[PDB]
């Protein structure tokens, strides 16, 4: 690989202003150019993009500007001989902070107060409603960049932390790590269950009616992974039946979440519009990954975040 | 002083169910009795109360179940020989968590999402709006139990932390401690300014138009102290003018906050109903101070949290 050009697909617009991103890449040593839906690639092309296009298969290298690459046909890239990288490793602080925010919102009742603020109502909680995260248990399912960002902040707040990962191996600040076949043991005693796994064959529909049964009735689910990791209809049923207490949800089976979803109306559900990782500096964070991999290519070393 | 009785004033019901507090004081070595608003007191009586009654001055000891004793006439107690203690030392975790919650709410825009949830609207923030607390500066004004509860959590979240206290003496996790005569220096570069001082002759009206001028236009004020530490009309004016960005307010010059107050309507104000220290274990927290002081009276040692 000898890269002569970085093309920036217009789909990066879904996550950030393209112009800001192009300006963040200006002294790379190769030209950085905007590319639209209908363009052609070839030897020496690198491409930064949000979604997949078949035209990218003519390029040497595609960088997906998301951590999740579940919408990329990974097998076709391998067969085409086209390198594919992702943006894992940059979302730990933003997502960890958002999730700390969700848990504190539930513990301190901030969402109920915000509801009351609209009515100008000085509504006091029941004595038993407010609690402290200190001493409460969180189970973090997926212990990568997102999961660890959550873990570190939960641990800092004095929470008891357990979690689940594919390898079952120790993780700093996690008292007990479980393999995925022991999910029900992991979630059983947790006040919060946080989902931070990629969407894969194995994780799709992982959290469904049996898991909501196992969960504490006073527990909340947090999904910052992908919508289809949860069976959304089972989630609705569990919330209506009281199998769990509530949820903070950033990702959904259909996005935007349809207006007629029952999820919008549960008091103890927080809906956020796939923004748990949002940051005014996203363009710089992704640009740094692109720069790193340019140097890797130039010096003939293995790419950071290589999917295939 | 030899205590023969602990009277539990009915005003404790403003903070916790009195039956829960009475039962948590069962092993004091003296009887614990409820006291209505028309109750007589004499030698041997200790009282546990939320607010002041002149009737208390015939008792030997009043324990205020709040940290703030500004509604108690301290000069009137000293002259009368009646001991006064407060409940400072028990609100660090509850207030610390709530303030962390407020700051994360603003950084991650959760309040705006909650507003959109009511309308079933999938409304992304503007790109420049979401940020991370990590790397941002907070000034904590008041470095006692509440202030340290805030500091420790802000520091753990990766914030730069400075603060203000009377003595100027070092405090763990505060990088620069200022005395109150350098308030403007302390607050000028802060993204968040947090108030955690008592209401005193010195602190009343501390934060007014000139301080809102000094503060960053992108900064937010957090008030978990007492309403009159801030000049409320100057706050409204500052929020209208954009001298600051917003505020999280748990305390007000008049509580409950009047429906007609303009503070309810600012998008970037969070109103909470004097609940930043709310917890379902408050009865246990308050009882343990009372137990402590009972033992110190027996051994004839100096009381904890003695006011006069
Ligand atoms: N809401 C949002 O805006 C965002 C969502 N995401 C989503 O989060 C996902 C995770 O991203 P990131 O943390 O960067 O990814 P990482 O690759 O850093 O980590 C993935 C983690 O998931 C674990 N894992 C894999 N399969 C399973 C399983 N079956 N059960 C439990 N754990 C499993 C891995 O285990 P091991 O450690 O053993 O390998 C690893 O700990 C992305 O794929 C994306 O879908 C990402 C960014 C933002
Ligand atoms: N919203 C709520 O529900 C609650 C509100 N509060 C309020 O918080 C107040 C503080 O409580 P707590 O932290 O327990 O009290 P503490 O006595 O532990 O701490 C008070 C702090 O205020 C500092 N201070 C005093 N005067 C000034 C000033 N002029 N400028 C800067 N700092 C000053 C003191 O400085 P130094 O240490 O140097 O003397 C001390 O560090 C209470 O009096 C009460 O009004 C308390 C509990 C709950
Ligand atoms: C969109 C950029 C991050 C958000 C999510 O898409 C991801 O997988 O990273
Ligand atoms: Mg309710
Ligand atoms: Mg259940
Ligand atoms: Mg707006
Ligand atoms: Mg930051
Ligand atoms: Mg003054
Ligand atoms: Mg002044
Ligand atoms: Mg209104």
Numbering used by the authors:
A (entry chain B), B (entry chain A): 1 to 308
Text lifted from the article:
Here we describe the molecular basis of the reaction mechanism and dual NADH/NADPH-specificity of D2HDH, a 2-hydroxyacid dehydrogenase from the extreme halophile Haloferax mediterranei, an organism whose proteins have to remain active in high intracellular concentrations of KCl. Sequence analysis has identified D2HDH as a member of the DDH clade of the D-isomer specific 2-hydroxyacid dehydrogenase enzyme family (2HADH), which has potential applications in the synthesis of chiral fine chemicals including alcohols, and hydroxy or amino acids from ketones or ketoacids. Structural studies have shown that all members of this family share a common fold based on two domains, which cycle between open and closed conformational states that serve to close the inter-domain cleft, bringing the substrates together during catalysis. The D2HDH dimer has an overall ellipsoidal appearance in which each monomer is folded into two domains (d1; residues 1–92 and 283–308 and d2; residues 93–282).
Thus far, to our knowledge, no structures of the wider DDH family have been determined with a reduced hydroxy acid substrate. To better understand the mode of product recognition by D2HDH, we attempted to grow crystals of a non-productive ternary complex of the enzyme with a variety of 2-hydroxyacids (including 2-hydroxyhexanoic acid) and NAD(P)H, to complement the 2-ketoacid structures described above, but the crystals that were obtained were of poor quality, and not suitable for structure determination. Under these crystallization conditions the enzyme would be expected to turn over the substrates leading to crystals that might contain a mixture of oxidised and reduced components. Given that the equilibrium constant favours the production of the reduced substrate, reaction turnover would lead to significant oxidation of the NAD(P)H to NAD(P)+ and the concomitant accumulation of mM concentrations of D-2-hydroxyhexanoic acid, albeit in a mixture with unreacted ketoacid in excess compared to the protein concentration (~0.1 mM). In this structure the refined electron density was planar for the nicotinamide ring consistent with the major component bound at the active site being the oxidised cofactor. Although the electron density for the substrate was clear, it could not be explained by either a ketoacid or a D-2-hydroxyacid alone. For example, fitting the density with a ketoacid left a significant additional bulge close to the substrate C2, particularly for subunit B. This suggested that a mixture of reduced and oxidised substrate was present. Careful refinement of this structure showed that the substrate density could be best explained as a 2:1 mixture of 2-ketohexanoic acid in the abortive orientation and D-2-hydroxyhexanoic acid in a productive orientation.
